[PDB]
RNA sequence: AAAUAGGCGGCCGUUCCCUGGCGCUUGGGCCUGGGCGACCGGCCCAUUGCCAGGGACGAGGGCUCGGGUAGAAGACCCGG
RNA sequence: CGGCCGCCGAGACCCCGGCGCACGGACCGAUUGGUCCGUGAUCGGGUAGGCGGGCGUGCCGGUGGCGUAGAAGCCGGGCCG
RNA sequence: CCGAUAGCGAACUAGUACCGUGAGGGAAAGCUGAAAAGCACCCCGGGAGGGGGGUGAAAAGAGCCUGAAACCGGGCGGCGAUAGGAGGGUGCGGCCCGAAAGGAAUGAGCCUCCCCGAAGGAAACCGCGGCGACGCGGGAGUACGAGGGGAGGGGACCGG
């Protein structure tokens, strides 16, 4: 159905619009998770993400919150947390969602048009990180 | 003929259901304004095999072009996704 | 609480302690490339000896006599079955395609009098037949269609990443198996085309200790350690003893944990598998390479080995061999693979061909 | 009685056993395993069980008993007593069927089902002045075998 | 069993007949008016395909046996 | 944080039909009870407790019925309350 | 009045079996059928066991009238080896059946036209405001709408 090219688009806004559409039962495929943007002070963003991974929920039963290290999976975990994967609809939705690493597609993408909060202008926004950089530091791949 | 046709949820607060009516987005309708042409149109959930659920719409939901619909019977939810006809 | 600390017993760094996934060792981690030369080689552990060497091996003298325990290992010659190609994906390294060699020489094989039916063994590698990996079904045809597939990969050109080799043993004197153990070894250089040329020459060739590896280097060893079976909390983790005299207790952990938290942690000592675990032990000095054993006609760089009466639990050693310093992980008769070191000590230099004053000739019994 | 349909004149032959002094649970594993085979295979199957060759897999009741190698379910055991006893039931269907004008060897076993019958009950000692039931179960097992041939 | 549920190389399964009924049901080529094309109409081919009645063949693997470098059972490894 | 506009969103409130209660009116009966109409916006949650109506069980009496062409009882289904 | 977990301790082998040194304490245990015809004769089986045939009727075949529940086997329908919990209610899909007590061939699920119609109640489109979000007037209390009536087609289930 949809091929989104998610270069230049803030993560939260992109993840909401997608999460809703998947519940409608209409496939979204997000391409280029890395090229994506997260707004805010980088210290804090990293600290927050790192902390999730750090557990040791007990001391490792291999249960309890985990968080992965690559920009792709960080994103794939995010759209899913916006989804209710416990229920039937959500579960069906998670299979409807796919993340692709790099671009393998030969075809043109699509976008969420609005520039209010869902596309950056890098000079205008005072503080940002690109999602791939925080993933390299965490241990994952660009 | 038919225009799609998506059942997303029931009219519902976060905590209440309201089983009686469902909220729909038809495709083409951008606005509260377009949705009113759909009023009175009969909506049918089709399922594999033959059993048949009619309902009408009867009210505008939006803001943006959602419409509410009532059925004789009601909808499982199982289909979040039904179709509406141009009758 | 006395407010006294107890440092942790056992590691969780060689955990989880559970059976190997194959009798063959596995590998992900490959050492440094700097030469167009074979990486990784194999043997069977023969037994052990002790050796007197002249230091060499930098340490607390660099000229007095030094005792070093030694593992004598019979290495089979190996035969590169195929060339495995990799392509780099998005998610990790995946194998593009392979050339195998269905094609059949007759094996340097011996065995057997009785005599009336010598019944020919003349080995197309009937050892491939005994290997449970299957085979076409038109030898010539298959090799060529694959070779053409290789030619493509070389052409494209940078689609292709590195080259590794599917390499298998040749049992041609060892009585502890007669079925090829099949493995992967990498072929390093510094750029794909040089690895591609070398692997292609290599495939029809029965190869040595000499080809792969040089004396006086430090080497890693990869192996599945000897299986104990299940062993106690005492054995697996280490447990201390207790108070005035305990009949009842003695081999015991007491607490598994508190009342809330209402769970069992995985770090508390319990019974379960010990041994038959995979281990890589770093930096073992290559004492020696030779071939035979028992007699050699020159008197320096060995005079030739093998205790009389064999070794307890090992057949006759007669084929290419390596004598490596200190402990080797595994049991007697187990396949071990050897890995060059990724980096060796640097506060202690390697020094080539270490001086071998004398070799044991007494049995382990 | 009998707990399945009949057409005994020319397509069914029946027999039943009453108050066999045998385990009902071990009768459950054999009836299920044996079910659906022809008589001859069923003889062969029973003979192997007695030799202590082919295991009877434990399935519905299965707890705290060692596994057994091969294809078929993890635990299993050998109920020698039951195999001997059931062999007699089967032999009786076979002699009868022949008078009835059925050829036994071809007939497939549709139905075999076990019934927990009356309970032989008493006491054996435990400590602290107390006695506890010490019981043997007595079991009925029915077999109704049916023709199938072309 | 990473649900984005992997990658490779090899090995396998990879069917018949009478009689009745059907075939742009299935599949291809050509002409011309209409169509960008698929498609309608005209021409040409099928040892064929389909339904109903009966019908073949059997790669891998365990169990088996002799022992263990393995092991509470089971498993594992090796040899036959 | 200071304004504003459009919406969403209860069993509430509005609205059709029905039901009980309370009260009035009428009728019916041999007692209890029942029915028909009207009024109720200002009647309808509910533990202790108070009251009021019905149901069921065993046997007795009167009365009036049923049963081997199948009673009670048992098990599943249908209908009413 | 009770009616066999009741009523006498006890419908009977009861003041028994049994307990306790003793004084004393103390149960449970009713039903074949018309006739015992209480199982011959025949087949099978080591067989005193057990199965078929043999009775008006053996869910009348030996603590045998009836023959519940818990529960146990098998079979039928449904679900079933990636997925969430007072085990359900309410509403709707799939599969399953339903002769029987129900309504419906004097027309079921279902389709279609027309009208009446409580509370409620638009749009397109037009003109004018409002910084804007959006609002007024007209369309228009119209379309629609719970609920009610007639006609018409199809042809078997619908509730449950």
Distance between CA atoms of residues B39 and B36, nearest Å: 5
| Preceding amide of D4 cis, omega within 30 | no
Residues B71 and B53: beta-carbon distance below 8 Å: yes
Q: Is the dihedral of CA C88, C91, C92, C95 positive or negative?
A: negative
Distance between CA atoms of residues C324 and C289, nearest Å: 9
* DSSP state letter for B13: -
- How many alpha carbons lie under 13 Å from residue C24 in its C-beta half-sphere? 14
Distance between CA atoms of residues D29 and D20, nearest Å: 16
Distance between CA atoms of residues C171 and C333, nearest Å: 13
Give contacts of B8 with chain A, Cβ < 8 Å: 20, 23-24
Euclidean distance between the first and the last CA atom of chain D, given in angstroms as a whole number: 31
Q: Is the dihedral of CA C135, C141, C142, C144 positive or negative?
A: positive
According to DSSP, the β-strands at D131-133 and D136-146 are unpaired
Method underlying the structure: cryo-EM
The reply to whether B60 Cβ lies less than 7 angstroms from strand F is yes
- C-alpha dist (Å) from residue C105 to A22, C109, C132, C167, C174: 60, 11, 19, 16, 20
The reply to whether A95 Cβ lies less than 7 angstroms from strand E is yes
The gap from C-alpha A50 to its chain's centroid, in whole angstroms, comes to 16
* Strand, coil or helix: D43: helix
Min Cα–Cα distance to chain B from A131, Å: 31
Residues A88 and A94: beta-carbon distance below 8 Å: no
Residue A89 forms contact with B (CB below 8 Å) = yes
Nearest chain A Cα to B23, which residue? A24
H or E element in which residue A78 lies = helix A71-81
**Residue from A19, A24, A83 whose CB has the most chain B CBs within 10 Å, to mutate:** A24
Distance between CA atoms of residues B67 and C262, nearest Å: 51
Number of H helices, E strands in chain C: 5, 15
Q: Locate A42 and state its tokens.
A: 């980088």
* DSSP state letter for B2: -
| Preceding amide of C137 cis, omega within 30 | yes
Distance between CA atoms of residues C238 and C328, nearest Å: 23
| Nearest to C55, CA basis, from C43, C68, C66 | C66
Distance between CA atoms of residues C362 and A22, nearest Å: 75
Task: Show the DSSP H helices in chain B as ranges.
Answer: 32-35
- C-alpha dist (Å) from residue C53 to C262, C330, C357: 58, 25, 5
The reply to whether C141 Cβ lies less than 7 angstroms from strand E is no
C-beta atoms of B6 and A89 within 8 A: no
- C-alpha dist (Å) from residue A127 to A124, A130, B5, C174: 9, 11, 42, 68
Per-residue exposure over B58-68, b if at least 16 CB sit within 10 Å of its own CB, e if not: eebbbeebbbb
> Who among A24, A88, A89 is closest to B6 (CB)?
A24
- C-alpha dist (Å) from residue A15 to A18, A98, D71: 5, 12, 49
H or E element in which residue C358 lies = strand C355-359
Nearest chain B Cα to A93, which residue? B80
Q: Locate C116 and state its tokens.
A: 């009336």
| Nearest to C307, CA basis, from C299, C317, C298 | C317
Distance between CA atoms of residues D15 and D24, nearest Å: 18
Residues C129 and C121: beta-carbon distance below 8 Å: no
Contact positions of strand G to protein Cβ (< 7 A): 43-47, 49-52, 59, 72-75, 82-84, 90-95, 110-112, 122-124, 143-145
Residue C91 forms contact with A (CB below 8 Å) = yes
- C250 has which bridge partners? none
| Nearest to C80, CA basis, from C130, C40, C138, C46 | C40
Residues D4 and D110: beta-carbon distance below 8 Å: yes
C-beta atoms of B8 and A89 within 8 A: no
Residue identified by tokens 């597939």 is C149
| Nearest to C20, CA basis, from C306, C218, C257, C226 | C226
Residue identified by tokens 């079925």 is C179
Give contacts of A58 with chain C, Cβ < 8 Å: 261, 263, 265
The torsion angle over the Cα atoms of residues C26, A70, A1 and B41, rounded to 10 degrees, is 120
Q: Hey, how many other C-beta atoms are within 10 angstroms of the C-beta on D99?
A: 8
Give me the CA D132–C1' G10 separation in Å, rounded.
30
According to DSSP, the β-strands at D76-77 and D56-57 are antiparallel
In chain B, % helix, strand, coil (3-state, to 5) comes to 5, 35, 60
| Nearest to A36, CA basis, from A133, A104, A110 | A133
| Nearest to D10, CA basis, from D123, D133, D96, D101 | D101
Distance between CA atoms of residues D63 and D25, nearest Å: 12
Q: Is the dihedral of CA A108, A113, A119, A124 positive or negative?
A: positive
Between A and B, how many CB-CB pairs are < 8 A?
Answer: 13
Residue C265 forms contact with A (CB below 8 Å) = yes
- Concatenate the DSSP letters of all residues of C173-221 into one string: S-SS--S--EEEEEEE-SSHHHHHHHHHHHTT-EE-HHHH--TT-EEEE
> How would you class C287 by CB atoms within 10 Å of its CB: exposed for 0-12, middle for 13-18, buried for 19 or more?
buried
The reply to whether B70 Cβ lies less than 7 angstroms from strand F is no
- C-alpha dist (Å) from residue C244 to C247, C250, C252, C304, D33: 10, 11, 15, 57, 59
- C-alpha dist (Å) from residue C234 to C5, C8, C13, C116: 20, 14, 18, 59
The gap from C-alpha D139 to its chain's centroid, in whole angstroms, comes to 10
Length of chain C, in residues: 365
Residues D73 and D58: beta-carbon distance below 8 Å: yes
C-beta atoms of A101 and C91 within 8 A: yes
Residue identified by tokens 């979204």 is A28
Contact positions of strand F to protein Cβ (< 7 A): 6-10
Distance between CA atoms of residues A9 and A114, nearest Å: 10
Min Cα–Cα distance to chain A from B4, Å: 12
Distance between CA atoms of residues C233 and C236, nearest Å: 5
Q: Hey, how many other C-beta atoms are within 10 angstroms of the C-beta on C346?
A: 7
Q: Is the dihedral of CA A81, A82, A88, A94 positive or negative?
A: negative
Residues A28 and A15: beta-carbon distance below 8 Å: no
Chains that touch A (3 or more CB pairs under 8 A): B, C
The reply to whether A62 Cβ lies less than 7 angstroms from strand G is no
* Strand, coil or helix: A32: coil
- C-alpha dist (Å) from residue A16 to A22, C266, C365: 10, 38, 74
Distance between CA atoms of residues C288 and C323, nearest Å: 5
- Closest residue to F7 (CA, C1′): B63
* Strand, coil or helix: A68: coil
- The vertex-D92 CA angle with D90 and D94, nearest 5°, equals 70
Give contacts of C266 with chain A, Cβ < 8 Å: 59-61
> How would you class B32 by CB atoms within 10 Å of its CB: exposed for 0-12, middle for 13-18, buried for 19 or more?
middle
List Cβ neighbours of A109 (8 Å cut-off, separation of 6 or more): A3, A4, A5, A6, A7, A31, A32
Contact positions of strand E to protein Cβ (< 7 A): 2-4, 6-12, 54-55, 60-64, 69-80
List Cβ neighbours of C49 (8 Å cut-off, separation of 6 or more): C69, C70, C71, C72, C305, C307, C323, C359, C360
């Amino acid at each position: 159905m949809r091929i989104i090219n998610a270069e230049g688009l803030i993560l939260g806004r992109l993840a909401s619009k997608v999460a809703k559409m998947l519940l409608e039962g209409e496939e979204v495929v997000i391409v280029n998770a890395e090229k994506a943007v997260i707004t805010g002070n980088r210290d804090v963003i990293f600290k927050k993400y790192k902390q999730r991974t750090e557990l040791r929920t007990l001391t490792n039963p291999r249960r309890g919150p985990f968080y992965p290290k690559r920009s792709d999976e960080i994103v794939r975990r995010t759209i899913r947390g916006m989804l209710p994967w416990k229920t039937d609809r959500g579960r069906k939705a998670f299979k409807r969602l796919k993340v692709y690493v790099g671009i393998p597609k030969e075809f043109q993408g699509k976008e969420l048009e609005t520039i209010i909060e869902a596309h950056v202008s890098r000079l205008s926004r005072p503080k940002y990180v690109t999602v791939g950089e925080v993933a390299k530091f965490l241990g994952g791949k660009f | 003929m038919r225009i799609k046709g998506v059942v997303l949820s029931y009219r519902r607060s976060k905590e209440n259901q309201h089983n009686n009516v469902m909220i729909i987005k038809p495709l083409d309708v951008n606005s509260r304004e377009e949705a009113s042409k759909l009023i009175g149109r009969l909506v049918l959930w089709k399922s594999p095999s033959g059993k048949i659920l009619k309902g009408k719409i009867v009210r505008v939901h939006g803001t943006k072009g959602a419409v509410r619909a009532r059925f004789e019977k009601g909808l499982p939810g199982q289909a979040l996704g039904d179709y509406v006809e141009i009758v | 609480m006395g407010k006294v600390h107890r440092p942790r017993r056992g590691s969780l760094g060689f955990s989880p302690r559970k059976r190997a996934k194959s009798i063959v060792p596995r590998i992900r981690s490959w050492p440094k490339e700097t030469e167009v030369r074979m990486l990784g080689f194999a043997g069977y552990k023969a037994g052990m000896t002790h050796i007197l060497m002249i230091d060499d091996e930098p340490g607390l003298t660099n000229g007095k006599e030094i005792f070093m325990p030694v593992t004598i290992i019979e290495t089979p010659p190996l035969r590169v079955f195929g060339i495995r190609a990799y392509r780099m994906g998005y998610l990790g390294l995946e194998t593009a395609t392979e050339v195998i060699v269905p094609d059949f020489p007759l094996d340097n094989y011996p065995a057997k009098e009785r005599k009336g039916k010598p019944k020919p063994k003349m080995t197309f590698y009937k050892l491939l037949e005994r290997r449970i990996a299957t085979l076409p079904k038109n030898y010539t045809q298959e090799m060529f269609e694959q070779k053409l597939g290789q030619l493509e990969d070389m052409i494209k050109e940078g689609e292709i990443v590195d080259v590794r080799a599917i390499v298998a043993t040749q049992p041609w004197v060892i009585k502890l198996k007669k079925k090829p153990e099949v493995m992967e070894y990498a072929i390093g250089g510094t750029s794909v085309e040089e690895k591609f040329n070398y692997i292609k020459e290599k495939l029809g060739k029965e190869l040595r200790v000499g080809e792969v590896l040089k004396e006086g280097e430090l080497l890693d060893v990869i192996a599945v350690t000897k299986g104990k079976g299940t062993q106690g909390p005492v054995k697996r983790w280490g447990i201390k003893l207790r108070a005035h005299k305990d009949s009842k207790g003695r081999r015991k952990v007491g607490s598994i944990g508190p009342w809330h938290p209402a769970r069992v942690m995985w770090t508390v000592p319990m019974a379960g598998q010990m041994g038959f675990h995979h281990r890589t032990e770093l930096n073992k000095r290559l004492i020696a390479i030779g071939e035979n054993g028992k007699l050699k006609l020159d008197e320096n760089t060995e005079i030739e080995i093998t205790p009389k009466g064999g070794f307890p639990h090992y057949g006759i050693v007669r084929s290419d061999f390596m004598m490596i310093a200190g402990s080797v992980p595994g049991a007697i008769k187990r396949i071990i693979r050897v890995r060059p070191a990724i980096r060796p000590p640097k506060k202690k230099p390697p020094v080539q061909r270490p001086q071998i004053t004398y070799v044991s000739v007494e049995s382990k019994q | 009685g009998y707990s399945f349909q009949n057409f005994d004149p020319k397509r069914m032959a029946r027999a039943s056993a009453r108050d066999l002094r045998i385990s009902p649970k071990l009768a459950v594993e054999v009836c299920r395993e044996l079910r659906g085979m022809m008589l001859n295979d069923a003889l062969r199957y029973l003979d192997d069980v007695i030799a202590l060759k082919r295991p009877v897999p434990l399935k519905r009741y299965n707890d705290s008993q060692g596994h057994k190698p091969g294809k078929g379910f993890g635990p299993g055991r050998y109920p020698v007593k039951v195999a001997k006893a059931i062999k007699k039931v089967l032999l009786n269907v076979k002699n009868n069927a022949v008078q009835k004008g059925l050829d036994p060897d071809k007939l497939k076993i549709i139905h075999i089902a076990a019934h927990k019958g009356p309970v032989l009950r008493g006491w054996y000692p435990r400590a602290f002045g107390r006695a506890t039931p010490f019981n043997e179960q007595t079991t009925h097992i029915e077999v109704v075998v049916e023709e199938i041939r072309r």
